[PDB]
Write an enzyme that holds these catalytic residues in place. Structure first.
Site, mmCIF file in Angstrom:
data_model
loop_
_atom_site.group_PDB
_atom_site.id
_atom_site.type_symbol
_atom_site.label_atom_id
_atom_site.label_comp_id
_atom_site.label_asym_id
_atom_site.label_seq_id
_atom_site.Cartn_x
_atom_site.Cartn_y
_atom_site.Cartn_z
ATOM 1 N N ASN A 17 0.822 -1.204 0.000
ATOM 2 C CA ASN A 17 0.000 0.000 0.000
ATOM 3 C C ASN A 17 0.856 1.255 0.000
ATOM 4 O O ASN A 17 2.063 1.191 0.218
ATOM 5 C CB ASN A 17 -0.889 0.012 1.245
ATOM 6 N N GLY A 19 2.824 4.168 1.245
ATOM 7 C CA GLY A 19 3.471 4.337 2.532
ATOM 8 C C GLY A 19 3.773 3.051 3.274
ATOM 9 O O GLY A 19 4.055 3.092 4.461
ATOM 10 N N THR A 23 10.005 1.757 -0.892
ATOM 11 C CA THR A 23 11.276 2.403 -1.197
ATOM 12 C C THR A 23 12.299 2.120 -0.098
ATOM 13 O O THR A 23 13.453 1.792 -0.383
ATOM 14 C CB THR A 23 11.100 3.925 -1.356
ATOM 15 N N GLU A 93 10.106 -1.137 -7.812
ATOM 16 C CA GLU A 93 9.083 -0.633 -6.891
ATOM 17 C C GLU A 93 7.805 -0.472 -7.699
ATOM 18 O O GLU A 93 7.762 0.292 -8.671
ATOM 19 C CB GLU A 93 9.500 0.712 -6.269
#
Ligand SMILES: Cc1cn([C@H]2C[C@H](O)[C@@H](COP(=O)(O)OP(=O)(O)OP(=O)(O)O)O2)c(=O)[nH]c1=O
Ligand SMILES: Cc1cn([C@H]2C[C@H](O)[C@@H](COP(=O)(O)OP(=O)(O)OP(=O)(O)O)O2)c(=O)[nH]c1=O
Ligand SMILES: [Mg+2]
Ligand SMILES: [Mg+2]
Lengths: 198, 198
Positions: A17, A19, A23, A93
C-alpha cells in the site's frame, strides 16, 4: 512475439500500500547497485512531466486527470519493465499490475474514472499483455495496516498527498489483499508476504 | 526488437481530412477482398466501446474526453497496424500518424488537451515508435478543400459531427498539408497526392 521478449533477468516486484515502505525496503539493496538493476521511486516521474505535476493534478481534479495520470503511470511502469540491463537480477518498486488491479480498479469504483475512461485503460492493458513482455518472477508484498500506512504518509508529507483520507488507504489495502493473498486478479505467481508494520 | 516486426505486407495508408472520402476510395478495392487486407472505417469502434460512444463524448466535452478518446484512437490504430494477415497487400483508413500529427496536435492548439494530457499522449507515441513496428510503405493523400469536406460531412450527417465548424476543418487541412506535403514533421514515407474534390 513481444517487445523485450527474453531480454529480462530474474525480476522481483516490490508491492504494498501507499506508505508501506517499498522504497525503504529497496534502499537495502543499494550497495549491490552494480550487480542488481534497481528501479525505485517511480513517483518522481509522475510529479514532474516536463514541468507538469500529474500526481497533484490527479488529486485535485480526479474526474478530469485520473485518466491521463493512470495512462502515464502505465507507460512509465512499462518503460521500467522493458528497460534493458545486463545485471542478473532486477528489482522494481511497483508494477503495471498494481496500477491496474489496485489503483485503476479503485478509481473506477469511487467514480474518479468514468466508464469510458476505465474501458480505454483496460483495452490498453489487454493489448499490452499481448504485445509486450513483462518479466515477473517474484513479488514481495509489504503487508501493512491502513493506519500504519496513513502514519508514514503523513510523516513523509508529500504536498500532493496532504488530502488522502484513511478510507482511501483502506480501499487500496483490501484491493492489495484480494490480489496478492487471495489472488482474485490473474497473477499472484510467486508471492512472499512480509509484515511491514516495522 | 519490435512487436509485429517483419510480419506485415506492403502497407498503404489512406489519409485525408474528415469527409475527404477515404472510405469511399477504399470501397473500390472491395472486390479484391481475398487478396488485400482491408481495414476501413475505424470510427465505428470509437462510436461504440462496450456501449460507450467516445466520439460523441469527445465532441460534447473535449476538455475532459479528448485525452481518453485520442488514447483509444491510438490503441485501435496500433491494433490495426500490427494485425496479422497472410495477404500480400494491406490498405488502411487513417493511421497512428494522422492521429498524432494532425488531431492530437490540433487539440493541443485549441486547448482541448491540457499540456499534461498532450505530454502523456506524446510520451506514449515515443515509446510506441521504439517498441512496436508500424509498417508504412505508401500513403495516399486524398487532398480536398475544407469547404468540400464540410459538405460531405454534413450529407453523411453523423450525429456526433453535427457541431463541427468549418474552421476546425481548415485547421485540420493545414495540418495535413504540413505533414503530407510541406514536410514540417516526422515522415520519410512516399506520398501520392490525389485531388479528392471529385
Ligand atoms: C502505482 C500508483 C501509484 N499512485 C499514487 C498513490 C500515491 O500518492 C503515489 C505513490 O504511491 P506508491 O506507488 O505506493 O509509492 P510510495 O512511494 O508512496 O510508497 P512507499 O512508501 O511504500 O515507498 O502515487 C496512483 O495514483 N496510481 C498508481 O497506479
Ligand atoms: C483519426 C482521428 C479521427 N477523429 C475524428 C474526426 C471525425 O469526427 C471522426 C472520423 O474522421 P476520419 O478519421 O477522417 O474518418 P471519416 O470516416 O470521417 O473520413 P472519410 O469521409 O474520408 O472516410 O473521428 C479524431 O477526433 N481524432 C483522430 O485522431
Ligand atoms: Mg516509494
Ligand atoms: Mg471513413
Amino acid at each position: 512475439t513481444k517487445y523485450a521478449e527474453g531480454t529480462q533477468p530474474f525480476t522481483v516486484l516490490i508491492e504494498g500500500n501507499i506508505g508501506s515502505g517499498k522504497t525503504t525496503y529497496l534502499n537495502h539493496f543499494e550497495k549491490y547497485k552494480n550487480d542488481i538493476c534497481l528501479l525505485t521511486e517511480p513517483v518522481e516521474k509522475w510529479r514532474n512531466v516536463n514541468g507538469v505535476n500529474l500526481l497533484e493534478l490527479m488529486y485535485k481534479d480526479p474526474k478530469k486527470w485520473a485518466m491521463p495520470f493512470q495512462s502515464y503511470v502505465t507507460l512509465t511502469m512499462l518503460q521500467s519493465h522493458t528497460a534493458p540491463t545486463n545485471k542478473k537480477l532486477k528489482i522494481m518498486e511497483r508494477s503495471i499490475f498494481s496500477a491496474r488491479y489496485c489503483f485503476v480498479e479503485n478509481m473506477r469504483r469511487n467514480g474518479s474514472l468514468e466508464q469510458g475512461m476505465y474501458n480505454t485503460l483496460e483495452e490498453w492493458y489487454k493489448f499490452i499483455e499481448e504485445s509486450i513482455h513483462v518479466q515477473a518472477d517474484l513479488i514481495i508484498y509489504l503487508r501493512t495496516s491502513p493506519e500504519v500506512a496513513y502514519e508514514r504518509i503523513r510523516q513523509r508529507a508529500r504536498s500532493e498527498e496532504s488530502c488522502v483520507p484513511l478510507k482511501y488507504l483502506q480501499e487500496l489495502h483490501e484491493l492489495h489483499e484480494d490480489w496478492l493473498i487471495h489472488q482474485r486478479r490473474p497473477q499472484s505467481c510467486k508471492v512472499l508476504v512480509l509484515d511491514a508494520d516495522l
